[PDB]
């Protein structure tokens, strides 16, 4: 039920078009390790 | 997918930015030391100090005109106030400028 | 030709000495107003209007708070008719924000990542001594 | 360890607790507000824009465009607020695209209801003398202006002129004293909270003269009746039975 | 199992158990206070409101009969856990007031520690002020000491300052700590106390009649700071068998009274543990992190 | 601009909506452009609508010039209310719309045949625009949101591409 | 259309400043390759620094193994025709209309079947690193890459915006040079794009160690030996790597001679250790004695 | 790939679902029944 509904919802949210536009999610942050590592490269820090 | 605070990320940021020095932000699961990445020597010299903290500089400010009275027609310059040691054209000269003639015709 | 009024009301009476002042800078306004859209730029054609809607309304705002030079009901009818700016004024009389360019660049929902221009950091703190222009005022830091 | 140390420690870590739980960034704080612009602005984009030929924008195309599909918008509630022939020049907020694409009145015209049907009643008046005791009506001819003469700037032609008497009906002074000032008004005591909610402009609350004025501008535009038994079978329930029967009364629908 | 609680909008900075181990109360940015049941499916019941700033510090009474409260708004306050309601508003702080501790057992008194300079005593029922020391600075943490004589604080200048209720002045003053000191926490035993400061380092002393003039005990490595210079705070456990910290670091860090060694760095959070809490009755631990949720692991 | 730049886009150099709204070929088509250029009833009924309103603007800018009077203009508002039909050509595209225009009869023979009791005469001097004015404010309130479907239909195709796959 | 959750990068490209921030906008461009709607995240490299954006697919991304937007490989980071040739790799990507939309229809649906984690394909099976690949990569970030353009007006005069001038105000670059027009079209398929001949001619004029004439001459000479080095230690740079038939440690010149039992043993050997044999931190040259 | 082309008969129409009342035939009573 969960599942199958909620592909429901965006596929007929898709038929609404004139979409009742909400708010931009507030602003994530992620956390990010490159595979690159090496002092020279991120000024030095193995994480952004 | 972290979640931070946000006056710091921008307090950082804006450190290593216009200082050129910052608290590197490695979290890592060995345990690291508060270490200043980027110009350390900088950070060294100049006490940690943020762009946001107010520090003493004594930095020479580059030269500004200020006419704020509003009630002359051609007067008021207000907000946008010119810098007074700035130019006055921007171009570029005799020699550059016929070598972009050339490269321009080499292309 | 002027600013034709709407109230019918008479003007209260320092509107005599304001007066040419103020007409002379409407004159200004048009003028700079229809001045078309040369090889200028797209995005500096615009900055003429917020230059001069500053001024007039800073005009006022000199002659009633820092002069003390006019009354009330002239002041509140010279808002009234569109010479000054109700909250560009209202602002201004705030504490951190005294020279504020044009009343957008503190807009915060009008740019992505939620701040003000660079126009709005005060110029010790940046200290690189570059140049400034808010693209929407054209202003070069205001305060 | 160096006490010179501890005190600029002190000052970093004042200032920056202070600024990162300053009230600014409190949790619910919503910030304030967009405050109008100036006129100018429009103005001088729409007549920057001109009709897009010039290849200098050649980018709003594609908004100028897509904005179509909302213009039914714009027309309504343009046309919903129009000027109300006792006013000269009425003036309305206005939200628009920052590349003039689109230009949408953001209003509704509330009206106090006694008050707009003694105006009307006064148009009534007004008119009728008039058309009684004027010796040739010229009407406008339809369209007012030719297939290609390109439409008229505002800042050229009627944003400097004066605008020419509108339908006011001449208010006495004695009988009509609680009302002569205010009457002819866009939004009549719209700032006044003795008689009105506030500028979001509901709830009115008026003083007896007033409408005894206010009954007696408007008695044109009225029923001279006192009382329900003359609508005997002429109501809305004896319509719905008579269409239920399909007989129809001597002077009612079918 | 795991069990995490969400249902909070901002940063939970402080997560405590009902001293009877039966409700929980939460706290942070949000500016109100949120309480749960431990039991069952872990679920939240009531709601306390009316603070403005951010609480920085909630605090039971030891039998859990009125609440108390530290809040950014220069303020502390005490409520009642009967209704949620407030009872006494604790004005008159100068600055923010981040800490705050009730006297176990002894008259009903309170010691908040401020951002203004001061420590502050306050009686309950007269709406005005006991003592107050001012010794320079900010004080991050405060508590007591189990007669109730004697009061412990924590700040920016690393030398933990305790002073004599009845002679008023700087009784006990330990040194040691590389940079500042994060949180205090005395066990049940009345005398071992617990002291997390951001130089990564965690510390215990036990304040006694007589103690050997240098009471730098036990000493653990493993928490950490960064450019967030979160508040930090530790607990003992009921038992004083085992340290419970938190870090910036996501990771909740247990350890040994006994043997100092690393029991736990458990992952699991998302952003930085500001508080963990350890039952009165079971081994449930309850971590509040800056992550806008909570953790209820059993160990 | 909006109805021109359509026109525009879709290549159709043949054509071009003059300032009254009227639609007008400036050559004569062969049969491919007779048919690429055929349009539908989402485009001309918005030709219609603009053209109802700038009827109802410049009426009111020909007051604010000085051109009129403010009983021509009363008047003059009347008149275009009570006879859309004759002005626009709007019930060529949704006929439906006589419902409307049935109404803003009726309402006229109410309103000149009490309005002309007396003395006054059969002439042109009767604005009272209020009744046709609500009549044709009711019809936009039914109208917007079929319209901007159709249009929003309309877009989407000119800018996705129609399609022919799994109809 | 795709959806991701970050870009895929090279460190170069990301920026200097542990701490970035970037916008997203979701089906905001047109992969130049895949030609379909993509995600597109846009991040300002560094302080005056252009902003950069993600210009090619996730899909488009993950089937050569590049950065989205640097488009060198992710490992080395040499453009994609010299890594091609480094992996000896032959890449069989379509390149008309249909077959090519076809092809990416399809390959993407069974990348959908992907862990997310590694390159699909031969980019797998050929991640064996050759020391060319090693010897060609760059060591640290040539962050001249982010800084903006060249100045049409200010290479005519005409930047009058001061000192804000939209792009490097400094001289235009001749554009006779190869340096110069590489399509990002070619430069996604490796189909003649000037910086990888010049590089693959660089890598060709890089030293190597000759190998001799005579296929009795068995003894390699090794010059630069120190007297920290034993010959049981020469034997472990030589000994498993086939068999070695004798060793003379020349003390009175630094160098030694190594005799071995396999010629092809030997040379993989001498070759493979050419000036980069470092053991101790000596500098050996790798030759076949007389 | 989502387009924003639309349809006269995808507007919502009979948006609840109707379930079997308590009288009408309810799974409950059909499960009793003999
Ligand atoms: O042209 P229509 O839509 O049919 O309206 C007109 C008109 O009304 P306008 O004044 O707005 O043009 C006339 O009005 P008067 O001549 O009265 O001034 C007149 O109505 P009368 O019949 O009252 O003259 C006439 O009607 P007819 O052709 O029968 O005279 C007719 O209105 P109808 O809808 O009545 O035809
Ligand atoms: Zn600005
Ligand atoms: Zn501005
Ligand atoms: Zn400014």
């Given at each position: 039920?969960?599942?199958?509904?909620?592909?429901?919802?965006?596929?007929?949210?898709?038929?609404?078009?004139?979409?009742?536009?909400?708010?931009?999610?507030?602003?994530?942050?992620?956390?990010?390790?490159?595979?690159?590592?090496?002092?020279?490269?991120?000024?030095?820090?193995?994480?952004? | 997918?972290?979640?931070?605070?946000?006056?710091?990320?921008?307090?950082?940021?804006?450190?290593?930015?216009?200082?050129?020095?910052?608290?590197?932000?490695?979290?890592?699961?060995?345990?690291?030391?508060?270490?200043?990445?980027?110009?350390?020597?900088?950070?060294?010299?100049?006490?940690?100090?943020?762009?946001?903290?107010?520090?003493?500089?004594?930095?020479?400010?580059?030269?500004?005109?200020?006419?704020?009275?509003?009630?002359?027609?051609?007067?008021?310059?207000?907000?946008?106030?010119?810098?007074?040691?700035?130019?006055?054209?921007?171009?570029?000269?005799?020699?550059?400028?016929?070598?972009?003639?050339?490269?321009?015709?080499?292309? | 030709?002027?600013?034709?009024?709407?109230?019918?009301?008479?003007?209260?009476?320092?509107?005599?000495?304001?007066?040419?002042?103020?007409?002379?800078?409407?004159?200004?306004?048009?003028?700079?107003?229809?001045?078309?859209?040369?090889?200028?730029?797209?995005?500096?054609?615009?900055?003429?209007?917020?230059?001069?809607?500053?001024?007039?309304?800073?005009?006022?705002?000199?002659?009633?708070?820092?002069?003390?030079?006019?009354?009330?009901?002239?002041?509140?009818?010279?808002?009234?008719?569109?010479?000054?700016?109700?909250?560009?004024?209202?602002?201004?009389?705030?504490?951190?924000?005294?020279?504020?360019?044009?009343?957008?660049?503190?807009?915060?929902?009008?740019?992505?990542?939620?701040?003000?221009?660079?126009?709005?950091?005060?110029?010790?703190?940046?200290?690189?001594?570059?140049?400034?222009?808010?693209?929407?005022?054209?202003?070069?830091?205001?305060? | 360890?160096?006490?010179?140390?501890?005190?600029?420690?002190?000052?970093?870590?004042?200032?920056?607790?202070?600024?990162?739980?300053?009230?600014?960034?409190?949790?619910?704080?919503?910030?304030?507000?967009?405050?109008?612009?100036?006129?100018?602005?429009?103005?001088?984009?729409?007549?920057?824009?001109?009709?897009?030929?010039?290849?200098?924008?050649?980018?709003?195309?594609?908004?100028?465009?897509?904005?179509?599909?909302?213009?039914?918008?714009?027309?309504?509630?343009?046309?919903?607020?129009?000027?109300?022939?006792?006013?000269?020049?009425?003036?309305?907020?206005?939200?628009?695209?920052?590349?003039?694409?689109?230009?949408?009145?953001?209003?509704?015209?509330?009206?106090?209801?006694?008050?707009?049907?003694?105006?009307?009643?006064?148009?009534?008046?007004?008119?009728?003398?008039?058309?009684?005791?004027?010796?040739?009506?010229?009407?406008?001819?339809?369209?007012?202006?030719?297939?290609?003469?390109?439409?008229?700037?505002?800042?050229?032609?009627?944003?400097?002129?004066?605008?020419?008497?509108?339908?006011?009906?001449?208010?006495?002074?004695?009988?009509?004293?609680?009302?002569?000032?205010?009457?002819?008004?866009?939004?009549?005591?719209?700032?006044?909270?003795?008689?009105?909610?506030?500028?979001?402009?509901?709830?009115?609350?008026?003083?007896?003269?007033?409408?005894?004025?206010?009954?007696?501008?408007?008695?044109?535009?009225?029923?001279?009746?006192?009382?329900?038994?003359?609508?005997?079978?002429?109501?809305?329930?004896?319509?719905?039975?008579?269409?239920?029967?399909?007989?129809?009364?001597?002077?009612?629908?079918? | 199992?795991?069990?995490?609680?969400?249902?909070?909008?901002?940063?939970?900075?402080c997560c405590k158990f009902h001293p009877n181990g039966s409700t929980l109360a939460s706290a942070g940015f949000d500016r109100l206070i949120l309480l749960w049941n431990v039991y069952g499916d872990c679920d939240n019941?009531?709601?306390?409101?009316?603070?403005?700033?951010?609480?920085?510090?909630?605090?039971?009474?030891?039998?859990?009969?009125?609440?108390?409260?530290?809040?950014?708004?220069?303020?502390?306050?005490?409520?009642?856990?009967?209704?949620?309601?407030?009872?006494?508003?604790?004005?008159?702080?100068?600055?923010?007031?981040?800490?705050?501790?009730?006297?176990?057992?002894?008259?009903?008194?309170?010691?908040?520690?401020?951002?203004?300079?001061?420590?502050?005593?306050?009686?309950?029922?007269?709406?005005?002020?006991?003592?107050?020391?001012?010794?320079?600075?900010?004080?991050?943490?405060?508590?007591?000491?189990?007669?109730?004589?004697?009061?412990?604080?924590?700040?920016?200048?690393?030398?933990?300052?305790?002073?004599?209720?009845?002679?008023?002045?700087?009784?006990?003053?330990?040194?040691?700590?590389?940079?500042?000191?994060?949180?205090?926490?005395?066990?049940?035993?009345?005398?071992?106390?617990?002291?997390?400061?951001?130089?990564?380092?965690?510390?215990?002393?036990?304040?006694?009649?007589?103690?050997?003039?240098?009471?730098?005990?036990?000493?653990?490595?493993?928490?950490?700071?960064?450019?967030?210079?979160?508040?930090?705070?530790?607990?003992?456990?009921?038992?004083?068998?085992?340290?419970?910290?938190?870090?910036?670091?996501?990771?909740?860090?247990?350890?040994?009274?006994?043997?100092?060694?690393?029991?736990?760095?458990?992952?699991?959070?998302?952003?930085?543990?500001?508080?963990?809490?350890?039952?009165?009755?079971?081994?449930?631990?309850?971590?509040?992190?800056?992550?806008?949720?909570?953790?209820?692991?059993?160990? | 601009?909006?109805?021109?730049?359509?026109?525009?886009?879709?290549?159709?150099?043949?054509?071009?909506?003059?300032?009254?709204?009227?639609?007008?070929?400036?050559?004569?088509?062969?049969?491919?452009?007779?048919?690429?250029?055929?349009?539908?009833?989402?485009?001309?009924?918005?030709?219609?609508?603009?053209?109802?309103?700038?009827?109802?603007?410049?009426?009111?800018?020909?007051?604010?010039?000085?051109?009129?009077?403010?009983?021509?203009?009363?008047?003059?508002?009347?008149?275009?209310?009570?006879?859309?039909?004759?002005?626009?050509?709007?019930?060529?595209?949704?006929?439906?719309?006589?419902?409307?225009?049935?109404?803003?009869?009726?309402?006229?023979?109410?309103?000149?045949?009490?309005?002309?009791?007396?003395?006054?005469?059969?002439?042109?001097?009767?604005?009272?625009?209020?009744?046709?004015?609500?009549?044709?404010?009711?019809?936009?309130?039914?109208?917007?949101?079929?319209?901007?479907?159709?249009?929003?239909?309309?877009?989407?195709?000119?800018?996705?591409?129609?399609?022919?796959?799994?109809? | 259309?795709?959806?991701?959750?970050?870009?895929?990068?090279?460190?170069?490209?990301?920026?200097?400043?542990?701490?970035?921030?970037?916008?997203?906008?979701?089906?905001?461009?047109?992969?130049?390759?895949?030609?379909?709607?993509?995600?597109?995240?846009?991040?300002?490299?560094?302080?005056?620094?252009?902003?950069?954006?993600?210009?090619?697919?996730?899909?488009?991304?993950?089937?050569?193994?590049?950065?989205?937007?640097?488009?060198?490989?992710?490992?080395?980071?040499?453009?994609?025709?010299?890594?091609?040739?480094?992996?000896?790799?032959?890449?069989?990507?379509?390149?008309?209309?249909?077959?090519?939309?076809?092809?990416?229809?399809?390959?993407?649906?069974?990348?959908?079947?992907?862990?997310?984690?590694?390159?699909?394909?031969?980019?797998?099976?050929?991640?064996?690193?050759?020391?060319?690949?090693?010897?060609?990569?760059?060591?640290?970030?040539?962050?001249?890459?982010?800084?903006?353009?060249?100045?049409?007006?200010?290479?005519?005069?005409?930047?009058?915006?001061?000192?804000?001038?939209?792009?490097?105000?400094?001289?235009?670059?001749?554009?006779?040079?190869?340096?110069?027009?590489?399509?990002?079209?070619?430069?996604?398929?490796?189909?003649?794009?000037?910086?990888?001949?010049?590089?693959?001619?660089?890598?060709?004029?890089?030293?190597?160690?000759?190998?001799?004439?005579?296929?009795?001459?068995?003894?390699?000479?090794?010059?630069?030996?120190?007297?920290?080095?034993?010959?049981?230690?020469?034997?472990?740079?030589?000994?498993?790597?086939?068999?070695?038939?004798?060793?003379?440690?020349?003390?009175?010149?630094?160098?030694?001679?190594?005799?071995?039992?396999?010629?092809?043993?030997?040379?993989?050997?001498?070759?493979?250790?050419?000036?980069?044999?470092?053991?101790?931190?000596?500098?050996?040259?790798?030759?076949?004695?007389? | 790939?989502?387009?924003?082309?639309?349809?006269?008969?995808?507007?919502?129409?009979?948006?609840?679902?109707?379930?079997?009342?308590?009288?009408?035939?309810?799974?409950?009573?059909?499960?009793?029944?003999?």
């Amino acid at each position: 039920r969960v599942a199958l509904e909620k592909s429901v919802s965006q596929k007929v949210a898709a038929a609404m078009p004139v979409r009742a536009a909400d708010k931009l999610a507030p602003a994530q942050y992620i956390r990010y390790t490159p595979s690159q590592q090496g002092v020279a490269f991120n000024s030095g820090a193995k994480q952004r | 997918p972290a979640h931070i605070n946000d006056f710091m990320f921008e307090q950082q940021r804006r450190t290593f930015a216009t200082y050129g020095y910052a608290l590197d932000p490695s979290l890592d699961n060995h345990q690291v030391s508060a270490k200043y990445i980027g110009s350390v020597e900088e950070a060294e010299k100049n006490q940690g100090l943020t762009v946001f903290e107010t520090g003493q500089k004594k930095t020479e400010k580059r030269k500004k005109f200020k006419e704020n009275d509003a009630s002359n027609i051609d007067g008021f310059l207000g907000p946008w106030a010119k810098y007074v040691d700035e130019k006055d054209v921007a171009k570029p000269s005799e020699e550059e400028q016929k070598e972009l003639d050339e490269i321009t015709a080499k292309r | 030709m002027p600013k034709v009024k709407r109230s019918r009301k008479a003007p209260p009476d320092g509107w005599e000495l304001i007066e040419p002042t103020l007409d002379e800078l409407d004159q200004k306004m048009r003028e700079a107003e229809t001045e078309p859209h040369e090889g200028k730029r797209k995005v500096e054609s615009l900055w003429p209007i917020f230059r001069i809607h500053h001024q007039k309304t800073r005009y006022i705002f000199d002659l009633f708070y820092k002069r003390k030079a006019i009354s009330r009901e002239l002041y509140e009818y010279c808002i009234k008719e569109g010479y000054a700016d109700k909250n560009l004024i209202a602002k201004w009389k705030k504490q951190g924000y005294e020279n504020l360019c044009c009343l957008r660049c503190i807009q915060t929902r009008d740019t992505n990542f939620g701040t003000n221009c660079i126009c709005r950091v005060p110029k010790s703190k940046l200290e690189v001594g570059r140049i400034i222009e808010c693209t929407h005022c054209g202003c070069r830091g205001c305060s | 360890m160096s006490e010179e140390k501890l005190q600029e420690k002190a000052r970093k870590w004042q200032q920056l607790q202070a600024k990162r739980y300053a009230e600014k960034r409190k949790f619910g704080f919503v910030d304030a507000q967009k405050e109008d612009m100036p006129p100018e602005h429009v103005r001088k984009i729409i007549r920057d824009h001109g009709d897009m030929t010039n290849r200098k924008f050649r980018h709003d195309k594609r908004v100028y465009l897509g904005a179509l599909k909302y213009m039914p918008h714009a027309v309504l509630k343009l046309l919903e607020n129009m000027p109300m022939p006792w006013e000269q020049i009425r003036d309305v907020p206005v939200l628009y695209h920052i590349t003039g694409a689109i230009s949408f009145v953001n209003e509704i015209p509330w009206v106090i209801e006694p008050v707009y049907i003694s105006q009307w009643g006064s148009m009534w008046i007004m008119m009728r003398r008039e058309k009684r005791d004027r010796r040739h009506f010229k009407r406008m001819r339809f369209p007012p202006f030719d297939d290609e003469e390109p439409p008229l700037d505002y800042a050229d032609n009627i944003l400097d002129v004066e605008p020419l008497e509108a339908i006011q009906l001449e208010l006495d002074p004695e009988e009509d004293a609680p009302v002569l000032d205010w009457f002819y008004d866009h939004q009549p005591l719209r700032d006044s909270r003795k008689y009105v909610n506030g500028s979001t402009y509901q709830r009115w609350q008026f003083t007896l003269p007033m409408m005894s004025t206010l009954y007696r501008l408007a008695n044109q535009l009225l029923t001279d009746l006192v009382d329900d038994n003359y609508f005997y079978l002429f109501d809305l329930k004896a319509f719905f039975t008579s269409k239920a029967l399909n007989m129809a009364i001597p002077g009612g629908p079918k | 199992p795991i069990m995490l609680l969400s249902g909070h909008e901002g940063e939970v900075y402080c997560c405590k158990f009902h001293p009877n181990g039966s409700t929980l109360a939460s706290a942070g940015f949000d500016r109100l206070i949120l309480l749960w049941n431990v039991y069952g499916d872990c679920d939240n019941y009531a709601t306390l409101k009316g603070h403005s700033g951010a609480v920085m510090e909630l605090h039971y009474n030891t039998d859990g009969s009125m609440l108390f409260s530290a809040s950014t708004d220069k303020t502390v306050a005490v409520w009642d856990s009967e209704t949620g309601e407030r009872v006494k508003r604790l004005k008159g702080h100068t600055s923010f007031v981040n800490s705050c501790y009730p006297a176990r057992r002894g008259p009903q008194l309170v010691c908040t520690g401020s951002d203004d300079g001061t420590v502050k005593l306050w009686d309950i029922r007269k709406k005005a002020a006991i003592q107050t020391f001012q010794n320079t600075y900010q004080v991050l943490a405060v508590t007591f000491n189990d007669t109730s004589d004697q009061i412990i604080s924590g700040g920016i200048d690393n030398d933990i300052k305790v002073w004599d209720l009845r002679q008023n002045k700087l009784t006990y003053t330990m040194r040691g700590h590389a940079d500042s000191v994060t949180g205090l926490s005395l066990s049940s035993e009345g005398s071992y106390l617990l002291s997390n400061a951001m130089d990564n380092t965690v510390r215990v002393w036990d304040v006694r009649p007589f103690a050997p003039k240098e009471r730098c005990v036990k000493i653990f490595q493993g928490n950490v700071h960064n450019f967030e210079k979160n508040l930090l705070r530790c607990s003992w456990s009921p038992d004083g068998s085992k340290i419970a910290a938190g870090s910036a670091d996501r990771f909740v860090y247990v350890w040994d009274t006994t043997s100092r060694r690393i029991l736990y760095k458990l992952p699991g959070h998302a952003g930085s543990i500001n508080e963990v809490a350890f039952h009165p009755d079971e081994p449930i631990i309850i971590s509040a992190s800056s992550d806008k949720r909570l953790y209820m692991g059993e160990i | 601009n909006m109805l021109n730049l359509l026109i525009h886009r879709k290549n159709l150099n043949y054509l071009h909506l003059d300032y009254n709204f009227n639609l007008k070929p400036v050559k004569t088509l062969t049969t491919k452009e007779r048919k690429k250029s055929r349009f539908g009833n989402a485009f001309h009924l918005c030709r219609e609508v603009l053209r109802l309103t700038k009827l109802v603007v410049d009426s009111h800018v020909q007051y604010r010039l000085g051109n009129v009077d403010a009983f021509q203009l009363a008047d003059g508002l009347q008149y275009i209310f009570a006879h859309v039909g004759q002005l626009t050509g709007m019930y060529r595209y949704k006929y439906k719309l006589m419902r409307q225009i049935r109404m803003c009869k009726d309402l006229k023979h109410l309103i000149y045949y009490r309005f002309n009791t007396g003395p006054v005469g059969k002439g042109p001097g009767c604005g009272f625009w209020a009744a046709g004015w609500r009549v044709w404010l009711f019809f936009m309130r039914g109208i917007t949101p079929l319209l901007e479907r159709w249009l929003g239909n309309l877009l989407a195709r000119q800018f996705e591409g129609r399609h022919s796959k799994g109809v | 259309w795709e959806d991701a959750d970050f870009p895929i990068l090279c460190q170069t490209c990301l920026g200097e400043n542990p701490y970035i921030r970037m916008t997203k906008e979701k089906y905001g461009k047109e992969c130049k390759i895949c030609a379909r709607p993509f995600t597109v995240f846009r991040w300002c490299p560094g302080v005056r620094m252009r902003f950069k954006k993600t210009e090619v697919c996730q899909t488009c991304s993950k089937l050569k193994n590049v950065c989205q937007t640097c488009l060198l490989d992710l490992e080395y980071g040499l453009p994609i025709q010299v890594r091609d040739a480094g992996l000896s790799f032959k890449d069989d990507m379509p390149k008309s209309d249909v077959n090519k939309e076809y092809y990416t229809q399809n390959m993407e649906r069974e990348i959908s079947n992907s862990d997310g984690t590694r390159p699909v394909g031969m980019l797998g099976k050929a991640t064996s690193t050759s020391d060319m690949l090693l010897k060609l990569a760059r060591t640290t970030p040539y962050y001249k890459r982010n800084r903006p353009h060249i100045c049409s007006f200010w290479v005519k005069g005409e930047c009058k915006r001061g000192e804000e001038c939209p792009y490097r105000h400094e001289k235009p670059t001749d554009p006779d040079d190869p340096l110069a027009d590489q399509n990002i079209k070619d430069r996604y398929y490796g189909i003649n794009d000037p910086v990888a001949d010049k590089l693959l001619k660089r890598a060709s004029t890089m030293p190597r160690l000759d190998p001799p004439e005579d296929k009795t001459i068995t003894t390699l000479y090794v010059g630069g030996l120190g007297d920290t080095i034993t010959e049981t230690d020469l034997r472990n740079h030589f000994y498993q790597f086939g068999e070695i038939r004798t060793i003379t440690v020349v003390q009175r010149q630094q160098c030694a001679f190594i005799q071995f039992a396999t010629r092809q043993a030997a040379e993989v050997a001498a070759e493979k250790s050419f000036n980069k044999l470092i053991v101790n931190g000596r500098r050996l040259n790798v030759k076949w004695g007389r | 790939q989502l387009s924003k082309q639309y349809s006269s008969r995808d507007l919502p129409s009979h948006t609840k679902i109707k379930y079997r009342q308590t009288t009408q035939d309810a799974p409950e009573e059909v499960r009793n029944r003999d």
